[PDB]
Amino acid sequence: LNPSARIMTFYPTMEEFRNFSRYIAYIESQGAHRAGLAKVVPPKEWKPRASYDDIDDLVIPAPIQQLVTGQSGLFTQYNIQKKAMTVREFRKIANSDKYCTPRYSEFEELERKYWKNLTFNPPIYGADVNGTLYEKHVDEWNIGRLRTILDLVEKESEGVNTPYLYFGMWKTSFAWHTEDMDLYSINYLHFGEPKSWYSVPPEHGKRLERLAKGFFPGSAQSCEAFLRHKMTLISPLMLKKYGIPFDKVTQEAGEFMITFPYGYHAGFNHGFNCAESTNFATRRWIEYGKQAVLCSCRDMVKISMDVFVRKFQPERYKLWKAGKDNTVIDHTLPTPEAAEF
Numbered sequence: 001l002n003p004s005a006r007i008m009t010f011y012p013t014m015e016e017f018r019n020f021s022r023y024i025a026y027i028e029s030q031g032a033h034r035a036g037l038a039k040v041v042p043p044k045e046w047k048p049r050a051s052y053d054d055i056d057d058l059v060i061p062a063p064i065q066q067l068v069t070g071q072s073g074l075f076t077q078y079n080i081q082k083k084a085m086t087v088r089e090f091r092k093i094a095n096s097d098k099y100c101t102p103r104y105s106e107f108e109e110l111e112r113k114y115w116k117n118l119t120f121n122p123p124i125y126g127a128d129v130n131g132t133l134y135e136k137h138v139d140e141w142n143i144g145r146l147r148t149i150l151d152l153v154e155k156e157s158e159g160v161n162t163p164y165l166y167f168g169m170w171k172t173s174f175a176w177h178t179e180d181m182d183l184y185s186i187n188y189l190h191f192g193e194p195k196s197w198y199s200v201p202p203e204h205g206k207r208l209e210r211l212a213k214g215f216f217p218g219s220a221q222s223c224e225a226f227l228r229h230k231m232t233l234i235s236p237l238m239l240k241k242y243g244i245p246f247d248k249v250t251q252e253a254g255e256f257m258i259t260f261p262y263g264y265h266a267g268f269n270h271g272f273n274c275a276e277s278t279n280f281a282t283r284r285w286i287e288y289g290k291q292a293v294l295c296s297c298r299d300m301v302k303i304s305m306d307v308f309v310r311k312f313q314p315e316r317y318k319l320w321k322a323g324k325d326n327t328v329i330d331h332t333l334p335t336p337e338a339a340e341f
């Protein structure tokens with residue numbers, strides 16, 4: 001299924017939505033993982049919070065000023081940490097004449113304005129704030145407690161399993177990358193202006209890596225997995241010029257985005273908004289975690305796979321420890337939990 005590897009959108013009912021892990025296995029049975037990114041529109045009746053009029057006192061402890069350098073669709077992003085500020089102070093700056101969104105009719109027009117102006121007037125991103133906007137009683141798709149097998153690290157083995165908040169403004173960006181340990185991720189857009197994404201199918205990920213290595217040879221010699229530094233920006237026109245397959249999608253308030261193992265993604269914010277995210281796992285991820293290429297030059301996020309191999313692959317434990325496990329990943333295959341569909 002999904003032989004084109006295009007980004008799929010799902011509209012689950014209230015009954016289908018209630019079981020997170022089962023619904024993840026369902027979208028994989030439909031071939032959603034092949035694109036490396038999927039959209040899930042929850043039922044209109046479901047709300048994770050009754051109101052967003054009570055979060056002005058929330059503190060953003062480490063805001064980052066995003067400085068961009070480059071030309072011809074090739075850029076490097078540098079971070080400057082600024083002093084702590086509240087959501088109220090952040091919203092005032094985000095909506096001010098200096099940083100607000102420019103006037104536009106079509107999305108294509110805004111996308112052109114982004115790629116033409118990303119090196120001028122550096123914006124401020126209220127990124128990686130530890131916290132949640134979900135109310136305590138919410139049991140459906142609660143980012144703060146998904147309860148997947150990723151919790152086996154947490155049970156006696158900065159958290160990858162904990163929630164993060166992202167306060168955006170016009171022209172704030174996220175560079176090309178896969179998740180830490182090639183895990184899955186979940187992103188919910190709570191309120192505000194849209195967030196646009198770019199994605200490369202996992203079956204074509206090595207092609208993006210080869211292109212990036214050719215463009216930045218100095219970075220590659222210093223670190224094998226330099227894309228994990230999250231500093232590299234490559235425009236969709238540069239990917240098209242070199243025949244790299246990719247897709248695009250715009251996420252609106254009240255919508256979920258799912259990233260899959262070894263799915264490269266990048267993107268930008270249209271204006272003032274707030275997103276919540278975390279990492280999660282399925283049984284299909286274990287092989288991805290065992291084979292993930294890690295950052296060498298840095299301190300970096302490293303999860304021991306030992307606990308997963310004992311529990312889910314006891315027959316291969318001895319062969320794995322000796323380094324003789326030569327399993328080849330087929331990126332098209334769905335998770336074993338999708339067997340019932």
Ligand SMILES: CN1CCC(c2cnn(-c3nccc4c(=O)[nH]cnc34)c2)CC1
Pocket residue numbers: 127128166173174179180185187195265275
């Ligand atoms: C400690 N942190 C762990 C998660 C790390 C991480 C991994 N992925 N990732 C992102 N992916 C998708 C969208 C966004 C986005 O809208 N803003 C910012 N970061 C994003 C951020 C950052 C560092």
Ligand SMILES: [Cl-]
Pocket residue numbers: 052053
């Ligand atoms: Cl608000």
Ligand SMILES: [Zn+2]
Pocket residue numbers: 177178179185259265
């Ligand atoms: Zn990500």
Ligand SMILES: [Zn+2]
Pocket residue numbers: 223224225226229295296297298
């Ligand atoms: Zn490195």
